[PDB]
Design a protein around this nucleic acid. Structure first.
Ligand SMILES: [Mg+2]
Ligand SMILES: [Mg+2]
Ligand SMILES: [Mg+2]
Ligand SMILES: [Mg+2]
Ligand SMILES: [Mg+2]
Ligand SMILES: [Mg+2]
Ligand SMILES: [Mg+2]
Ligand SMILES: [Mg+2]
Ligand SMILES: [Mg+2]
Ligand SMILES: [Mg+2]
Ligand SMILES: [Mg+2]
Ligand SMILES: [Mg+2]
Ligand SMILES: [Mg+2]
Ligand SMILES: [Mg+2]
Ligand SMILES: [Mg+2]
Ligand SMILES: [Mg+2]
Ligand SMILES: [Zn+2]
Lengths: 136, 62, 211, 25, 83, 132, 101
RNA sequence: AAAUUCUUGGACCGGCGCAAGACGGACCAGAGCGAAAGCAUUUGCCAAGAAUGUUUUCAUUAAUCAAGAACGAAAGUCGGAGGUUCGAAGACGAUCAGAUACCGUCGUAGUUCCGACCAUAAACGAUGCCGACUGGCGAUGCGGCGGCGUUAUUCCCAUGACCCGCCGGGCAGCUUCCGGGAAACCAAAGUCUUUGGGUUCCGGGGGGAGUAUGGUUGCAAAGCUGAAACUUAAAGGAAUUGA
């Protein structure tokens, strides 16, 4: 729980995988390989109503909790892998992406590289909904 | 979690579903480099000081 | 708190790169059947080339897989090459032709690789028209030129030398130079290098990859 | 009533007429 | 223009016309004398040869057919003829 | 909403050229001008006419106004319009001539003028804007 | 009466273009008829670039873009105001609106 | 907005692999080919095809076409294989006065491949085919021809990539007091009371009605052919002004 044994003067790097969907936000810090989870706080566990799971306020609250727990383990800098739902469905990142990443930059973390890892398909299976679409 | 106070730089316009809240951009006197846009309820001049309970969320423009 | 029984291991890149330290990794310490070594034997690291080289491009990434643990030091090897999505999505623009090719080739040692490559037709400085396309038969002879080149700087040497060629864009550069006589094309890169089969592991070989 | 549903209703009616005639033939 | 003379066009605008659309039809092809750099005889070759023509004696080849005019091999001089 | 109606604007635009010499710069003096020089049915309308005339004069000083022709300003145009130089701008001891027009001249009886000069035509037909 | 010369689409000598799926809802729209929008934005808004830049471990770090192409049906285009109805004379011109900002 | 739904028996999320079946984004355009339906990863094989080029060959061999023939989206039908996704029917949760719907969770037939049926679509350019003539302008695709000039081979001829033109078919675009039209509009929907180039199909106020019946095709669903009694002063097209 103390963290890495290393002298100062260098950063130790983790990676946060941000999943900014339209229904909630996942802030999920892991090591370089991605195999070891270090802290996963979701935007939906910081609100009392499930209408606000995707709120930018929840994303800000989630990132602050992740950053504070990240400081405990000793990680100082993060690489960003922004991600929308992607795949067959919509590919634009949700409202929580902007606020979740801004919080990590204001909570003492150091931002490394930013990349987009949304899963675009070469072509996927037929999409949910009728031929007439989701009409309302 | 401290509380910040800031000064408005200009008045951007009147917003809200009924025109009751104003968007202005605030400028901290603690830090002369950071400015953000916030909604404010009530009549607001230029140069007055707004007490910000929390100063982390940004108000979308109209 | 599981993180109390977790220790940290350093990760070392092969000697063929300038910078040695990738970072640090976690693992649950050896407790009964679960050995701390086997948990670190299949880690894959996506590191950009600008991180490994002292000063190079930032749009190329390499997959480094840990092979052995020599005691607080994980030993990695080349596993795959990849081109960042930001750059990849930026080269694809309208009113031009995309040309793609792939080859399956085995180096002198038993390493089997897939090499995906991309190239786009370039518009003249003098050009007035907008389309800037290529005939189908020109596209065919460019990519057969593009396959026949890439297979010769890989099957003639070993895994060490092909990665040395991968650090610059030498494979992409030669494709540019050869195919200009057919149709001049500008944004040529080796888009992706998948590695299919490894040879049987021999610890002596790895220690040459790490000095 | 659009012509699509009108002709659907007509087809159902014709099917019943044909069945009832084949009942007696 | 209204009073354009259809009987008398200048050779400038009559050459650009389609071979069938001239005032009177006339082919655009011609014959020519092709001499190899090696031998001394001169052969008559159609401009749009449409076949691989080679000089007798099996010395070399003369022309290579294309989608239009035939192209002559390197070094073979040609001069067209009239009558 | 202090917008001048056409009745106030038209009288000001008529008074001003007929008495530009008398009308001045201040509002109170030319308020006295308008009262006798034109019949105004009411005071409040006289003040608005006189006030606009005061505003119009300041515009006239900087430059001519398109609506009003002050008798002193169009007479300045005649000396601006009747100006002629002393040496013709069309007289040159050498002129830049492209070769093809020298052939166009050659087809005429002007085979060789005295003050012609052959200039090299541009190489590369780069005269169409790129398409996009 | 026939509203548009080309019947709302760009099919002129084909007889069949493959359909696609809109992005707002999953409506099936022909590829030529659909309203394409190729947006190119930063990962972070202009209000957050300084915050990220002050936190970057590098120096003079370029900010990555995010390229995605949107497809819209006619109904979803009118409702999202990407396009709107024009006068009969104004329907014919087809240059895009000004790209000044 | 929620709920049905999964969830310490560890869901969602992160990595590493494996399996299957669909699908071929971005490039992708008022661009190409095909009789229409339709057709988009690489490579190989087989047969075909328009256009261009031609001082080659035959010499009227042609155009349109009752009866007849081949192809014909999707859905549907019959036998095998496979069944990832989506999803008629169906079940449930919402919404609602009701909701056998729109919205959400699951989900059968189907959607996929093979071998046979079916012959219908707003199968649309709502516009038969062949031929002739009657304004421009700028592009685009294919073939050929000509020409200052840049660039690659390199080692120059010649080839590719640009540039400027001409010719022939092709999908189209802009403009016009050609002309027409009820107008919308059309360079064809023009060359029409100044009416006749050739030829096929097809309409005769609105319904009843693509109905009844007879025939014929089909495993079936259904396809083609197809009335009458009776009822009705309108039904409809284009454009204008209000609401
Ligand atoms: Mg449904
Ligand atoms: Mg609606
Ligand atoms: Mg209408
Ligand atoms: Mg169709
Ligand atoms: Mg593709
Ligand atoms: Mg028939
Ligand atoms: Mg079918
Ligand atoms: Mg079926
Ligand atoms: Mg079956
Ligand atoms: Mg219900
Ligand atoms: Mg449903
Ligand atoms: Mg489902
Ligand atoms: Mg029909
Ligand atoms: Mg019809
Ligand atoms: Mg007649
Ligand atoms: Mg009738
Ligand atoms: Zn839609």
């Amino acid at each position: 729980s103390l963290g890495p044994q290393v002298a100062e003067g260098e950063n130790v790097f983790g990676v946060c995988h941000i999943f900014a969907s339209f229904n909630d936000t996942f802030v999920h810090v892991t090591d370089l390989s991605g195999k070891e989870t270090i802290c996963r706080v979701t935007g939906g566990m910081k609100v009392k109503a499930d209408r606000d799971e995707s709120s930018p306020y929840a994303a800000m609250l989630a990132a602050q909790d992740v950053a504070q727990r990240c400081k405990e383990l000793g990680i100082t800098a993060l690489h960003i892998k922004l991600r929308a739902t992607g795949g067959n469905r919509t590919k634009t990142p949700g409202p929580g992406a902007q606020s979740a990443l801004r919080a990590l930059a204001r909570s003492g973390m150091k931002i490394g590289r930013i990349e987009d890892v949304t899963p675009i398909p070469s072509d996927s299976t037929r999409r949910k909904g009728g031929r007439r679409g989701r009409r309302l | 979690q401290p509380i910040k106070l800031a000064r408005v730089t200009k008045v951007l316009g009147r917003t809200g579903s009924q025109g009751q809240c104003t968007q202005v951009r605030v400028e901290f006197m603690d830090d002369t480099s950071r400015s953000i846009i916030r909604n404010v309820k009530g009549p607001v001049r230029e140069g007055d000081v707004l007490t910000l309970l929390e100063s982390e969320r940004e108000a979308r423009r109209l | 708190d599981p993180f109390s029984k977790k220790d940290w291991y350093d990760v070392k890149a092969p000697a063929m790169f300038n910078i040695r330290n990738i970072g640090k990794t976690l693992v649950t310490r050896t407790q009964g059947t679960k050995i701390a070594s086997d948990g670190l034997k299949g880690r894959v690291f996506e590191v950009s080339l600008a991180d490994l080289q002292n000063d190079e491009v930032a749009f190329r990434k390499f997959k480094l897989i840990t092979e052995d643990v020599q005691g607080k030091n994980c030993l990695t090897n080349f596993h795959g090459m990849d081109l960042t999505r930001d750059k990849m999505c930026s080269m694809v623009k309208k009113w031009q032709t995309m040309i793609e090719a792939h080859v399956d080739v085995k180096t002198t040692d038993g390493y089997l690789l897939r090499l995906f490559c991309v190239g786009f037709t370039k518009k003249r400085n003098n050009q007035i028209r907008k389309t800037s396309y290529a005939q189908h038969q020109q596209v065919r002879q460019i990519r057969k030129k593009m396959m026949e080149i890439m297979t010769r700087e890989v099957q003639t040497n070993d895994l060490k030398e092909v990665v040395n060629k991968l650090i610059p864009d030498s494979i992409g550069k030669d494709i540019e130079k050869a195919c200009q006589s057919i149709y001049p094309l500008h944004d040529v890169f080796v888009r992706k290098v998948k590695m299919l089969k490894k040879p049987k592991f021999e610890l002596g070989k790895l220690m040459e990859l790490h000095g | 009533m659009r012509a699509k549903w009108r002709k659907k209703r007509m087809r159902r009616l014709k099917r019943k007429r044909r069945k009832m005639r084949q009942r007696s033939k | 223009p209204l009073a354009k003379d259809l009987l008398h066009p200048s050779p400038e605008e009559e050459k650009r016309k389609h071979k069938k659309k001239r005032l009177v039809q006339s082919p655009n092809s011609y014959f020519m004398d092709v001499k190899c750099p090696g031998c001394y005889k001169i052969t008559t070759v159609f401009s749009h040869a449409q076949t691989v023509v080679l000089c007798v004696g099996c010395s070399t080849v003369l022309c290579q057919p294309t989608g239009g005019k035939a192209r002559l091999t390197e070094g073979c001089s040609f001069r067209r003829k009239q009558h | 909403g202090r917008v001048r109606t056409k009745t106030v604007k038209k009288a000001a635009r008529v008074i001003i050229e007929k008495y530009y010499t008398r009308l001045g710069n201040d509002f109170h003096t030319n308020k006295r001008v308008c009262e006798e020089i034109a019949i105004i049915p009411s005071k409040k309308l006289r003040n608005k006419i006189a006030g606009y005339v005061t505003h119009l004069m300041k515009r006239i000083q900087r430059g001519p106004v398109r609506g009003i022709s002050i008798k002193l300003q169009e007479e300045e145009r005649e000396r601006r319009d009747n100006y002629v130089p002393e040496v013709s701008a069309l007289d040159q001891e050498i002129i830049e001539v492209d070769p093809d027009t020298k052939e166009m001249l050659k087809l005429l009886d002007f085979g060789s003028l005295s003050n012609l000069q052959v200039t090299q035509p541009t190489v590369g037909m780069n005269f169409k804007t790129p398409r996009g | 009466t026939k509203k548009r010369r080309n019947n709302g689409r760009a099919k002129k000598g084909r007889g069949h273009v493959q359909p696609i799926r809109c992005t707002n809802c999953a409506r099936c729209v022909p590829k030529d008829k659909a309203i394409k929008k190729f947006v190119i934005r930063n990962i972070v808004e202009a209000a957050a670039v300084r915050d990220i830049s002050e936190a970057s471990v590098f120096d003079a770090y370029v900010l990555p873009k995010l390229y995605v192409k949107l497809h819209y049906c006619v109904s979803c285009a009118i409702h999202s105001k990407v396009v709107r109805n024009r006068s009969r004379e104004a329907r014919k011109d087809r240059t895009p609106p000004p790209r000044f900002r």
